[PDB]
């Protein structure tokens, strides 16, 4: 129980961080999403 409480805490933190990172990545992109493939790669990595 203690192990999985710690695991769930870390997992919820990770989901929060991923959602915030995806939001900020879409916010700070300049021009269009498809102009650079780094944004595409980052978004796909965050989704997976």
């Amino acid at each position: 129980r203690s192990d999985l409480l710690k695991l769930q805490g870390e997992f919820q933190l990770r989901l929060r961080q991923l959602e915030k990172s995806l939001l900020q990545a879409l916010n700070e992109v300049k021009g269009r999403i498809l102009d650079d493939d780094t944004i595409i790669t980052t978004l796909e990595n965050l989704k997976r």
Binding site: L23, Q24, L26, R32, L34
Partner: protein, 48 residues
């Protein structure tokens, strides 16, 4: 601030879907011009 972030994200997504639609259109035009180029090429190859 979270409202402005979400509006930016939604606007970016809509811009992206419009871009992919127009890029489908560009792909179709590219295919047509490629086909007409290749056709004329083979015609003058038979001429040679």
């Amino acid at each position: 601030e979270q409202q402005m972030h979400l509006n930016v994200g939604l606007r970016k997504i809509k811009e992206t879907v419009d871009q992919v639609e127009e890029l489908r259109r560009d792909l179709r035009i590219k295919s047509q011009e490629l086909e007409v180029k290749n056709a004329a090429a083979n015609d003058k190859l038979k001429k040679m």
